Design a binder for this molecule. Structure first.
Ligand SMILES: [Cl-]
Ligand SMILES: [Cl-]
Ligand SMILES: [Fe+2]
Ligand SMILES: [Fe+2]
Lengths: 480, 501
């Protein structure tokens, strides 16, 4: 076997990116200010954090084993629980005490044969009394919301029709359905997309097989009352390249940003229309909804070719036979990503969005101090913004010149709160202290920290996270 | 409000919790620790160490470091790999404060400052030893807390199946490698300010063997003791307890300039309390015992750290006077005691080395018998050895400092010194026999380093053939607060203690 290094080396594991690899508990986290006493629930977030040094030099950040953080809030107190997902990779590498899984999404570089290659390191969502730890090349891993014990790879009682499960399922607040898909749904380099949904009784509802015009990355999707929408990133998979030891993904300058529209209920695969947005990068979906003309308003981060994407509105008409789309309109000027809405209006008209920004205004980030301490290979964000879509008012939270942010969560103030009224939480990297902090903001004034929770350790830059409110028996908020 | 408790802060403040002393308070696992160099693959066992680490901010401003809840680290070694397991002792203090989510226990050894009545006040934060399949987490004002060596689960306060005769159990029991006895005592054994010492021992069958009640000439701190084939020896630190001072909110301990360093000698087997002889060493501070043994004349050679002033300077005299931090040096002293002698005053001890030293360890395979190897912490004040300008603003305020280890060969007089570097400090070391046939003092030394450059802890592995060379440096991703005592439990020892030489 290629030798297993006994310590981490290279930019992906330097400074703030150095793996900690802790599993366990820190109760009674230190707090500056006051956590509102009525907040009750858990903030779950996932970070890639390699458990063992990779035998692959400069293994990318996005290949790291999924480590789940839960912040448990009650009566103005907060406790941390942290545990690795017991993926096949994690379990087999822990038993061997060395790395065995190879390059990102290239099984031809693995030192042993894996059934499931998931690092479960992209998203952590709640479904019917379990957490689902998500990686778009794999089924979910089911976990206990209270103990963070791993139950195992989850196939929804043998109903899962796809080899793959998106990191970005949508929760319909009216129907209580989890709306899902997988791309490369029949394995490496396949153009198969499987669209499927689960009702609140846990039974599969939709299953539709459709065909992508290229084997492209479909990272995120959008759901409206009557449609599901598949934006394709121009990253394209060739299995022949992989068999020679090459990358799963390669950028294709020549192709549009395809946006597939499929009827949400009772469709065949041939019903998909592959609209052609101008060449660019499909970032995260904020939300999509049908307007009173029945046209789809798709709001998502969009880049051409630190966060360098813009908050785009695409207008889609399923009835239109013209496949080429106009350039989108832009809702704000900011370099942005990681958009969140009040999920009580998901798949319907939203008028509040919260997102990460990278403000390049001189002085906002002390780059001279931060860059030599930051390591490499994770998105950077130096603030949050709140857009009111009705008034056009924007509030910006800037944590400080020596701090960066992850993706935020939104918490309704209570079950009677107006859309976008409540609290925002976001994990900060404090490069001064080389510690993580959890900031609690009131949506009445996003510029002010109501509480700053001071972790005694670093949490590596992570990916997605979700709020599970104690008032919601099914873990998801009630519709507005 | 009229009965309102003093407020509990929601974050740590003060020097005792700044920089490297900032509480982490993590419980759980870090497996497969990063290693520079190579851990010798034949090393198999666990290094257990305890640190005081407050779980909740004290209602007392600037609460001393030594008031922190006992947090147990285990470093599990096998086949050149090492895993960390970390867990708090479930003391009454820990459990009740966790349930209230606030501090309730008051000053060090002053129950009159507690916000509620405790049955057991232990923080179990001084030592962690192995006895008959359990860990015992030790604090000299309390019985031990029993813990699982594999999971670090707390079983609870331990009274040795109802046999424990004392309210108190020393942090420094001795393990006789020939008889396999655990030799123990407690001072203040009948409660606050009592002069009662209970000397007791447990055989390898778990049954109590000795129990002797004796009387201290003063209510003085007996932190450590020594055991020979035929004697037990009680050196008293001139820190003295007055209960009347405690009732007014004052310190348990206060320095007494006027008294000798008393050294009590009691026959080890079948004695009455009246058989103790209270020898009078010159006024000074009784530091840790390396080891004691009887020579061929039957005289006791007691080897211990000894200072001429108050090492525990945070407990000063009645006028609040004492030494500054770093002012008092302890030296490696040899006291000669003859139980048959009727002269109570003793000569000044002889000194084995010049170094400012403490935390002496021997090859415990010769404990209570003649030893010819000692490993100890040193504090070298030679300019440049510690970069104080860099370290002091990052160190917070904690235990007196160590910037190296030394190995003394008592036969040859040869000393080797391990200096980890100008921006690193050391804890107490452990000694590991190379194997069951190794000569005395032949094997490995481990020591936890505080690396102030990286603000991380490291575990250094040394071979006794050359103490100056790190064979492996284990790089923890976190800080472990400076701790107190630790012990090696070798996988080759069914009872957790090495076989006699
Ligand atoms: Cl598990
Ligand atoms: Cl326990
Ligand atoms: Fe994503
Ligand atoms: Fe001690």
């Amino acid at each position: 076997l290629p030798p297993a290094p006994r310590y981490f080396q290279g930019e992906n594991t330097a400074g703030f990116m150095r793996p900690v690899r802790f599993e366990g508990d820190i109760t009674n986290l230190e707090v500056v200010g006051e956590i509102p006493k009525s907040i009750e629930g858990t903030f779950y977030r996932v970070m890639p954090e390699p458990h063992l040094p990779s035998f692959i030099p400069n293994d990318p950040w996005f290949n790291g084993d999924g480590n789940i953080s839960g912040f448990y809030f009650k009566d103005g107190h907060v406790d941390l629980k942290q545990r690795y997902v017991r993926t096949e990779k994690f379990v087999r590498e822990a038993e061997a005490r060395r790395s065995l899984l190879g390059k990102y999404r290239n099984r031809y570089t693995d030192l042993v044969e894996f059934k499931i290659r998931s690092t479960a390191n992209t998203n952590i969502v709640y479904w019917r009394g379990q957490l689902l730890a998500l990686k778009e090349d794999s089924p979910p891993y089911a976990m206990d919301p209270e103990t963070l014990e791993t139950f195992g790879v989850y196939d929804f009682d043998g109903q899962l029709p796809s080899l793959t499960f998106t990191a970005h399922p949508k929760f319909d607040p009216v129907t209580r359905e989890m709306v899902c898909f997988g791309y490369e749904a029949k394995g490496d380099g396949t153009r198969d997309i499987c669209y499927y949904s689960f009702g609140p009784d846990g039974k599969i509802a939709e299953t539709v097989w459709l065909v992508s015009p290229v084997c492209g990355m479909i990272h995120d999707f959008a759901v409206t009352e009557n449609f599901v929408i598949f934006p394709i990133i121009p990253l394209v998979c060739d299995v022949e390249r992989m068999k020679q030891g090459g990358d799963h993904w390669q950028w294709d300058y020549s192709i549009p940003m395809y946006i597939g529209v499929l009827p949400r209920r009772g469709a065949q695969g041939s019903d998909v229309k592959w609209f052609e947005a101008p060449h660019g990068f499909a970032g995260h979906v904020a939300n999509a909804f049908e307007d009173d003309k029945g046209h789809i308003q798709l709001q998502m981060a969009y880049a051409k070719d630190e966060v360098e994407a813009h908050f785009a509105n695409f207008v889609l008409d399923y009835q239109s036979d013209k496949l080429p789309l106009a350039e989108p309109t832009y809702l704000v000027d900011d370099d942005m990503e990681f958009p969140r809405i009040d999920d009580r209006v998901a798949t319907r008209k939203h008028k509040h969005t919260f997102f990460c920004i990278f403000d390049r205004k001189p002085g906002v980030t002390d780059f001279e101090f931060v860059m030599p301490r930051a390591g490499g290979g994770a998105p950077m964000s130096n603030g949050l913004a709140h857009l009111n879509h009705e008034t056009g008012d924007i509030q910006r939270y800037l944590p400080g010149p020596r701090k960066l942010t992850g993706e935020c969560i939104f918490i309704p103030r209570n079950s009677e709160a107006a859309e976008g009224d409540g609290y925002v939480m976001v994990l900060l990297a404090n490069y001064e202290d080389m510690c993580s902090e959890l900031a609690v903001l009131d949506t009445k004034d996003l510029t002010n920290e109501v509480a700053l929770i001071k972790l005694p350790v670093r949490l590596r830059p992570g990916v997605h996270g979700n709020w599970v409110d104690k008032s919601d028996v099914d873990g998801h908020p009630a519709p507005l």
